[PDB]
């Protein structure tokens, strides 16, 4: 199937004392593999998946140098933005950055991204052409003219179509035992009476990977959204995910209702009904 590599960075200013709090995380698909936290003791990029631990000292020293340099860029940016938006030195503000690449089933480049936000709102983003910029307001328009003059999109395009995809392929190979394994959802249905004549049917999908999944209810073979509830996909904590969908039904009529589960690990979607 398709794969992705993504890095996420958050910096939160601390006007009271000291430097911003900085947290960086790296993912391959839905698997975290590296982290940096400015509050942690190591002051190094740290492994979070077994398959990245084999990387040598040059890798760890290099990623530590680069992630600390990213933290300093965010620190400077928080100051610049406070100036661009004419804000007080007294409040805490946040910058967020995400970048990475997607490859298809053949592991060839599909798309690249580099997005930045200030205080939880879009600031500037590289367009899908990897040449152009989306600036949300006039402060970001100032950044856009600066980054056009500094050949920034060229540098990002070279990384996104080159380094990013090359290293994603390396990680997919090194971590093949888990990264290239799909864990189909383990499904079951539960029944919870809500009165002496109606009940909730809850369709569960457990221990699946990757996180993408679709759960839908049908009644007599047509989609049912009335009297249904669908929770957000949630992490189990062991690297897999969970979700459920529920419907309220008249007791005795449970056989009319079917839950349909779609996932990359299922060659054909599953259909579940309540076991009377």
């Amino acid at each position: 199937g398709s794969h992705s590599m993504r890095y996420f960075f958050t910096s939160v200013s601390r006007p009271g004392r000291g430097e911003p709090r900085f947290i960086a995380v790296g993912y391959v698909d839905d698997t975290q593999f590296v982290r940096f936290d400015s509050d942690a003791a190591s002051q190094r990029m740290e492994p979070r998946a077994p398959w990245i631990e084999q990387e040598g000292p040059e890798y760890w020293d290099g990623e530590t140098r680069k992630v600390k340099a990213h933290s300093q860029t965010h620190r400077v940016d928080l100051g610049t933005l406070r100036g661009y938006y004419n804000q007080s030195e007294a409040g805490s503000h946040t910058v967020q950055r995400m970048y990475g690449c997607d490859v298809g089933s053949d592991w060839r480049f599909l798309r690249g991204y580099h997005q930045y936000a200030y205080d939880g709102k879009d600031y500037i983003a590289l367009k899908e052409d990897l040449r152009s910029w989306t600036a949300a307001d006039m402060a970001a328009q100032t950044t856009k003219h600066k980054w056009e003059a500094a050949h920034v999109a060229e540098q990002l395009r070279a990384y996104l179509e080159g380094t990013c995809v090359e290293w994603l392929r390396r990680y997919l190979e090194n971590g093949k035992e888990t990264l290239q394994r799909t864990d189909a959802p383990k499904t079951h249905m539960t029944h919870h009476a809500v009165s002496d004549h109606e009940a909730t049917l809850r369709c569960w999908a457990l221990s699946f990977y990757p996180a993408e999944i679709t759960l839908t209810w049908q009644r007599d073979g047509e989609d049912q959204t009335q009297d249904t509830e669908l929770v957000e996909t949630r992490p189990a904590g062991d690297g897999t995910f969970q979700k459920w969908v529920a419907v309220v039904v008249p007791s005795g009529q449970e056989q009319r209702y079917t839950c349909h589960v779609q996932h990359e690990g299922l060659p054909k979607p599953l259909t579940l009904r309540w076991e009377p």
Binding site: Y7, G26, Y59, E63, K66, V67, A69, H70, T73, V76, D77, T80, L81, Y99, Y116, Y123, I124, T143, K146, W147, A150, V152, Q155, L156, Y159, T163, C164, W167
Partner: peptide
């Protein structure tokens, strides 16, 4: 692998 030098805003 991370990007290297970033351009400030």
């Amino acid at each position: 692998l991370l990007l290297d030098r970033l351009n400030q805003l």
